[PDB]
Amino acid sequence: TASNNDLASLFECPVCFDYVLPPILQCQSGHLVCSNCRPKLTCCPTCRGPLGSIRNLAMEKVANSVLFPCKYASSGCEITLPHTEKADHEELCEFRP
Amino acid sequence: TASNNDLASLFECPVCFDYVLPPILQCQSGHLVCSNCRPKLTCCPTCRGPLGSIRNLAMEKVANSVLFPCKYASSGCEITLPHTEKADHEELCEFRP
Numbered sequence: 001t002a003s004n005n006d007l008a009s010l011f012e013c014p015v016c017f018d019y020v021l022p023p024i025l026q027c028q029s030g031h032l033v034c035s036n037c038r039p040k041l042t043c044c045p046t047c048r049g050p051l052g053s054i055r056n057l058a059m060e061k062v063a064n065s066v067l068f069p070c071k072y073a074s075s076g077c078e079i080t081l082p083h084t085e086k087a088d089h090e091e092l093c094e095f096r097p
Numbered sequence: 098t099a100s101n102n103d104l105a106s107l108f109e110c111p112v113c114f115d116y117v118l119p120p121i122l123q124c125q126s127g128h129l130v131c132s133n134c135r136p137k138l139t140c141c142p143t144c145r146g147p148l149g150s151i152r153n154l155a156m157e158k159v160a161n162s163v164l165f166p167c168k169y170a171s172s173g174c175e176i177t178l179p180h181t182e183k184a185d186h187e188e189l190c191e192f193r194p
């Protein structure tokens with residue numbers, strides 16, 4: 001059936017391909033942007049509609065069921081983490097630059 | 098970790114407690130209502146904001162990873178179904194009235 005990596009990929013930011021973690025915002029048509037890309041943009045990167053601040057509460061609840069890969073996976077980190085632990089892990093991760 | 102019934106419950110309509118299936122709409126603040134309850138309402142049953150028609154595309158994608166219980170589970174149906182098969186199953190289900 002369904003897998004954790006299948007669910008996690010639904011949170012990928014279409015701009016940086018890191019993960020969109022709570023709080024999760026979206027445009028009128030349902031496109032996501034992460035917290036870090038959002039301030040560098042004047043509109044939705046997918047549809048060019050306004051970014052806005054519609055709240056995707058349901059996706060935040062899904063996120064409590066997903067283990068998200070460390071942002072340093074491409075440097076060789078194999079740890080996957082609940083979203084509440086991801087930031088603290090990445091700050092001390094063996095594979096950070 | 099996470100379970101299928103945990104994910105499925107995130108789709109429960111807060112009005113009838115059946116499941117909100119694609120296409121999934123939501124209010125400004127992220128509350129869901131199913132296709133059948135929506136026309137019987139003049140505003141979001143959770144926050145009383147406008148119902149609107151913001152599209153929760155991400156939840157629709159999650160839904161492709163979830164097996165949803167037959168609406169006649171409380172009559173004793175134990176079948177759980179991909180959302181694309183749920184309606185046809187319920188039309189012939191052993192446990193319909």
Ligand SMILES: [Zn+2]
Nearest residue numbers: 013016034037
């Ligand atoms: Zn991003």
Ligand SMILES: [Zn+2]
Nearest residue numbers: 027031044047
């Ligand atoms: Zn958009």
Ligand SMILES: [Zn+2]
Nearest residue numbers: 070072077093
């Ligand atoms: Zn790491």
Ligand SMILES: [Zn+2]
Nearest residue numbers: 110113131134
């Ligand atoms: Zn309903």
Ligand SMILES: [Zn+2]
Nearest residue numbers: 124128141144
């Ligand atoms: Zn609402």
Ligand SMILES: [Zn+2]
Nearest residue numbers: 167169174190
């Ligand atoms: Zn059934």
